Amino acid sequence: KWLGTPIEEMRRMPRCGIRLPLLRPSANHTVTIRVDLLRAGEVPKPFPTHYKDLWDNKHVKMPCSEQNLYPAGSRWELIQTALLNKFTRPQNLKDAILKYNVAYSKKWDFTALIDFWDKVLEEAEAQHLYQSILPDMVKIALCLPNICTQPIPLLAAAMNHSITMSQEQIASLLANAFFCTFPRRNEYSSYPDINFNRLFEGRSSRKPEKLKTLFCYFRRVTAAAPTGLVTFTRQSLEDFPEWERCEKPLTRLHVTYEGTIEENGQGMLQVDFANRFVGGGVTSAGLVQEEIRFLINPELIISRLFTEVLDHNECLIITGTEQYSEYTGYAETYRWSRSHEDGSERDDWQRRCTEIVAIDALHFRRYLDQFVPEKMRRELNKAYCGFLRPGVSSENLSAVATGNWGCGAFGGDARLKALIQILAAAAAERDVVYFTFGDSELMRDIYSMHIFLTERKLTVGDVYKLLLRYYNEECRNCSTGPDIKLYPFIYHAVESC
Numbered sequence: 001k002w003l004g005t006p007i008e009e010m011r012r013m014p015r016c017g018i019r020l021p022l023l024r025p026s027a028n029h030t031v032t033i034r035v036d037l038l039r040a041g042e043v044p045k046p047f048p049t050h051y052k053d054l055w056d057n058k059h060v061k062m063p064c065s066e067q068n069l070y071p072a073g074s075r076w077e078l079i080q081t082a083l084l085n086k087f088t089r090p091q092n093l094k095d096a097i098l099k100y101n102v103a104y105s106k107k108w109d110f111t112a113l114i115d116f117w118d119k120v121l122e123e124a125e126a127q128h129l130y131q132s133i134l135p136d137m138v139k140i141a142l143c144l145p146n147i148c149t150q151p152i153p154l155l156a157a158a159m160n161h162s163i164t165m166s167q168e169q170i171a172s173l174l175a176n177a178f179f180c181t182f183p184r185r186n187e188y189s190s191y192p193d194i195n196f197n198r199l200f201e202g203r204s205s206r207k208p209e210k211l212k213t214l215f216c217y218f219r220r221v222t223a224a225a226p227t228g229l230v231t232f233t234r235q236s237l238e239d240f241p242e243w244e245r246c247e248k249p250l251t252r253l254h255v256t257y258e259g260t261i262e263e264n265g266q267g268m269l270q271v272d273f274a275n276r277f278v279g280g281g282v283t284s285a286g287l288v289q290e291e292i293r294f295l296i297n298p299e300l301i302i303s304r305l306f307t308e309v310l311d312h313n314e315c316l317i318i319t320g321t322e323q324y325s326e327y328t329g330y331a332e333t334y335r336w337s338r339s340h341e342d343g344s345e346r347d348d349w350q351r352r353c354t355e356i357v358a359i360d361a362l363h364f365r366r367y368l369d370q371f372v373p374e375k376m377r378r379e380l381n382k383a384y385c386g387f388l389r390p391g392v393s394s395e396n397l398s399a400v401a402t403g404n405w406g407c408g409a410f411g412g413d414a415r416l417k418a419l420i421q422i423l424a425a426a427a428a429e430r431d432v433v434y435f436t437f438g439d440s441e442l443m444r445d446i447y448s449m450h451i452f453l454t455e456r457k458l459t460v461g462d463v464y465k466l467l468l469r470y471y472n473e474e475c476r477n478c479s480t481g482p483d484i485k486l487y488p489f490i491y492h493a494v495e496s497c
């Protein structure tokens with residue numbers, strides 16, 4: 001069921017972790033809670049004590065700002081009046097949300113919300129939804145100015161910057177996104193959507209499963225406030241390796257066709273197969289790896305409030321999100337299963353020991369395009385950025401938990417992408433744990449190539465130069481896919497030398 005290094009020999013957080021420094025705000029680290037009062041098992045206290053507002057192009061525009069206006073009245077006062085009404089039928093909730101979104105009263109479809117409430121839920125489940133969950137969501141949404149008291153900077157392009165906030169603050173913000181209260185988000189063309197209006201549209205059979213997953217989270221965090229923190233870090237590198245000259249050896253590999261990144265990769269650097277707009281279609285139509293992870297760990301979704309579209313040299317690293325739901329299936333078969341009791345330990349900043357990196361692979365309209373050297377180097381550098389932790393010893397780096405990044409809809413070749421990730425992890429001095437989700441032949445193929453290359457002592461540079469040879473000798477002048485596939489080429493090239 002698995003091959004390579006036993007997964008028990010791979011490094012995992014928290015045990016491999018370095019001692020964290022004292023949490024403190026700085027020019028490159030926004031911290032929205034009182035660090036002097038951070039205590040295990042206690043709800044973090046916001047800093048500052050009273051709400052402070054910034055309404056500009058460098059920060060989130062909060063719905064509770066005095067500058068949030070509507071024809072001139074306070075839009076926040078209007079939001080409060082709209083949402084503080086009894087809901088008893090789904091049209092009530094549609095009408096409430098549109099009271100402060102009048103310009104979208106014809107554009108925004110709520111069919112999936114109406115159908116979930118009227119045509120999917122049983123009567124008692126609907127009753128719990130509108131008598132308990134929705135009012136509790138309103139109340140934490142309207143509590144926003146007492147909870148998120150500090151302006152949140154945008155993580156804009158080329159910024160190296162972290163935001164550390166409480167799970168409770170994220171809950172209040174996500175409740176606002178659900179009720180579609182974020183102004184000017186319906187100057188943000190380079191940011192993902194944040195308001196949930198596209199979750200309410202259409203008749204996809206997966207919308208009830210998305211809604212069940214999110215309401216599971218909203219029921220949990222409004223019933224009992226979570227006590228931990230989450231860190232969002234935008235990382236962009238200015239210097240990338242000279243891959244052809246890299247003399248580093250390959251690291252260890254565990255590869256398996258069973259298990260999942262989230263369950264079996266606990267304490268490891270977990271890859272999110274991201275869209276450059278992070279989260280992809282989580283609050284619209286998509287439901288593959290990235291969207292599933294954003295639904296079962298919804299605190300990931302708030303990255304869309306403040307994370308600008310990723311450039312080629314950038315990633316987003318999120319530490320501390322909690323798993324609230326279990327699921328079955330994938331894509332068209334995804335179903336919400338039950339609530340999840342996250343058993344991850346917390347670090348000395350009270351963050352769950354769960355580290356997720358969003359890295360976006362390229363979309364290849366034509367299969368052979370991905371073997372062009374600039375396109376291979378692009379993917380190597382993206383993965384490297386996602387894996388590198390500058391100034392951390394290899395002993396304190398967990399293994400990378402990943403799989404067929406960019407394959408499927410984006411057209412990536414699984415065997416090439418496996419090799420690219422292996423090279424990037426080697427250069428970042430991390431081991432690899434690779435999940436092939438049922439593809440046992442791919443498991444065997446990746447293991448066999450990895451052991452071949454390691455037993456022959458080939459460096460990262462040795463391998464990269466073979467990839468260039470493959471392009472130049474089998475791809476560049478190809479007429480049709482090439483006659484010879486990548487791994488057969490590599491075997492023949494190395495063995496004949």
Ligand SMILES: Cn1c(=O)c2c(ncn2Cc2ccc(CC3C(=O)NC(=O)NC3=O)cc2)n(C)c1=O
Pocket residue numbers: 260261288289329330331332403404408409437438
């Ligand atoms: C990353 N990862 C997986 O690869 C995975 C998985 N469970 C099964 N698989 C394998 C797999 C791969 C491709 C498709 C096709 C496809 C579709 O049929 N319909 C769409 O809409 N999109 C699509 O890509 C389905 C299934 N889990 C939990 C996971 O995390």
